[PDB]
């Protein structure tokens, strides 16, 4: 009895955001500022090659910490051609308005990975199969939206190709708005106390019963992190690191691997200083490495041999992955609101325009004689739109805490049949990243959709929603 579909889709796999920062006083580094006495940003690929050349000059004639110029230079050579890669030069002025030192900040990442096109194409083909079995006329009524971010449009483009300018960027609905950033900071400060001292798993807050107090979990993660840093150092100092993995996608090499983890090891070596914003960073890198650098991850963290044969050795690492998922399940989802009122206000400030559009599109599909509208959005809108759904009081089949992580290519579906059925998918998500069978593509298949509600009267679902718009 199908009549239409309004599907919200998250962007596909992306690389972790990474940056190197160092300050230099040598003249060759100061000359990169080209006389300017304020922050200088470099994003022209040709300008990056010139800066790259400056690092090679510094190398031949010692100008700065040689070890640190190599890591910046090596990272830049591999990353100079990636959109979003930039250099920031922050000059430091002394009492006489003279630049005495310049901070060199190299930032890169946040681009869709080589795996994203595969994930998006499978979904577009799957949806073509699904549609050509429900009603072939639906393909003639496809409308596609995308945020302005490159990673989001990238996902939208390959899904559209797989499904069949038609993609209509809509900044007001699907791009980020500073309306909720004022309120998410009020919330962010509220999460720090939840993790420290001895808060007894405050209220429900998405936390397992068998787990000890949040502060104990953090302290154990620090122990596992301090443990693996020493393994990594021991492996770099003794073994050949360049032979620990035969495939390096995205132009990465063992040096960039060490940098991502060296930073995290620095940020997770004192439990009384762990920042809750950095839990998501730790967990984002663990998925990335488990997806794209498993072999090197195995070997560079391989302890060796402890007497007995085949004695399991990746015990401390599996524990670390498990504990990071707990922290990611009870901090990051609560950046969009802790209390129901916070989840509500942040949810409206972020996704109210999109929510009004969806109900109207469902209303049009009822009056037309089926169609589909796909909105490709950043990760933030999926949580917030979901929060609006729950706080509306509409009868659910599953509680919020029970939903799986809203991973890459997570979807929210509004199926119109008169009756509305809500379904969701966690996207390309796995419960055992260290055991999943991977291809050379470093690509995980997508999880089928699950029903959030049953068939609910259309006229009913509009009152509960329009009552929350006050
Ligand atoms: Zn200037
Ligand atoms: Zn890869």
Residues contacting residue 158 through CB under 8 Å, at least 6 positions apart: 12, 116, 117, 120, 121, 124
Please tell me the distance from the alpha carbon of residue 359 to that of residue 469, in angstroms, as a whole number: 13
CA neighbours closer than 13 Å in the CB half-sphere of residue 270: 5
Domains assigned to the chain: 4-13+113-181+338-467 (3.40.50.1240), 18-108 (no CATH), 206-335 (no CATH)
What are the residues whose beta carbon lies below 5 Å from ligand 2 (ion)? 249, 292, 442
Distance (angstroms) between ligand 1 centre and the Cα of 26 equals 20
* Ligand with smallest separation from the Cα of 40: 1
Distance (angstroms) between ligand 1 centre and the Cα of 399 equals 55
* Contact assessment for residue 447 and residue 427, using Cβ atoms and an 8 Å cutoff: yes
Distance (angstroms) between ligand 2 centre and the Cα of 262 equals 20
Q: Token pair 């890169």 is at which residue?
A: 108
* Contact assessment for residue 324 and residue 286, using Cβ atoms and an 8 Å cutoff: yes
Please tell me the distance from the alpha carbon of residue 281 to that of residue 276, in angstroms, as a whole number: 9
* Ligand with smallest separation from the Cα of 99: 1
What are the residues whose beta carbon lies below 5 Å from ligand 1 (ion)? 36
- Which residues face 6 on adjacent strands? 373, 414
- Look at strands 4-10 and 371-377 and give their pairing: parallel
Q: Name the resolution in angstroms.
A: 3.4
Q: Say if residue 378 is exposed, middle or buried (CB neighbours under 10 Å; 0-12, 13-18, 19+).
A: middle
* Ligand with smallest separation from the Cα of 442: 2
Distance (angstroms) between ligand 1 centre and the Cα of 39 equals 8
* Ligand with smallest separation from the Cα of 89: 1
CA neighbours closer than 13 Å in the CB half-sphere of residue 381: 27
Please tell me the distance from the alpha carbon of residue 429 to that of residue 165, in angstroms, as a whole number: 31
Phi, psi of 95 (to 5 degrees): -60, -20
Select from 344, 423, 405 the least CA-distant residue to 127: 423
> How many angstroms from the chain centroid is the CA of residue 11?
9
């Amino acid at each position: 009895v199908f009549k239409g579909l309004a599907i919200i889709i998250r962007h596909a796999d992306r690389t972790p955001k990474q940056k190197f920062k160092h300050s230099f006083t040598s003249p060759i580094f100061i000359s990169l500022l080209k006389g300017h006495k304020e922050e200088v940003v470099i994003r022209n690929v040709n300008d990056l090659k010139i800066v790259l050349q400056a690092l090679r000059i510094a190398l031949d004639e010692k100008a700065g910490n040689p070890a640190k110029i190599k890591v910046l230079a090596n990272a830049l050579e591999k990353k100079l051609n990636f959109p979003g890669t930039k250099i920031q030069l922050k000059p430091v002025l002394n009492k006489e308005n003279e630049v005495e030192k310049v901070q060199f900040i190299l930032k890169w990442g946040g681009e869709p990975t080589h795996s994203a096109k595969y994930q998006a194409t499978e979904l577009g083909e799957q949806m073509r199969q699904d549609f050509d079995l429900l009603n072939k006329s639906i393909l003639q009524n496809i409308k596609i939206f995308s945020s302005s971010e490159r990673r989001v449009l990238h996902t939208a483009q390959y899904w559209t190709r797989a499904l069949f300018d038609e993609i209509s960027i809509r900044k007001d609905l699907l791009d980020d708005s500073n309306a909720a950033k004022d309120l998410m900071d009020k919330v962010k400060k509220k999460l720090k106390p939840l993790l420290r001292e001895g808060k007894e798993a405050p209220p429900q807050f998405a936390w397992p019963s068998k787990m000890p107090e949040p502060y104990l979990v953090i302290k154990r993660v620090v122990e596992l992190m301090n443990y693996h840093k020493k393994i990594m150092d021991n492996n770099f100092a003794k073994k050949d690191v360049n032979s620990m993995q035969t495939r390096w996608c995205t132009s990465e090499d063992p040096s960039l691997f060490k940098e991502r983890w060296d930073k995290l090891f620095k940020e997770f070596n004192n439990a009384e200083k762990v920042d809750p914003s950095k839990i998501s960073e730790l967990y984002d890198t663990m998925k990335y490495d488990a997806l794209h650098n498993r072999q090197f991850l195995e070997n560079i963290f391989d302890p060796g041999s402890s007497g007995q044969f085949d004695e399991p050795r990746f015990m401390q690492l599996r524990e670390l992955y498990k504990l990071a998922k707990v922290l990611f399940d009870f901090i990051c989802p609560k950046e969009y609101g802790i209390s129901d009122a916070e989840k509500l206000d942040i949810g409206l400030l972020t996704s109210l325009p999109l929510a009004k559009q969806i109900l109207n599109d469902i209303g049009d599909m009822k009056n037309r004689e089926p169609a589909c509208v796909a909105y490709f959005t950043k990760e933030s809108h999926i949580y917030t739109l979901l929060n609006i759904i729950y706080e509306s009081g509409i009868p659910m089949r599953i509680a919020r805490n029970a939903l799986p992580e809203l991973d890459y290519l997570s979807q929210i579906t509004f199926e119109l049949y008169h009756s509305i059925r809500l379904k969701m998918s966690p996207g390309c998500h796995t419960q055992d990243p260290l055991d999943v069978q991977l291809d050379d593509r470093h690509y995980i298949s997508c999880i089928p959709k699950i029903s959030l509600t049953k068939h609910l009267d259309m006229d009913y679902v509009q009152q509960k929603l329009r009552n929350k718009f006050t």
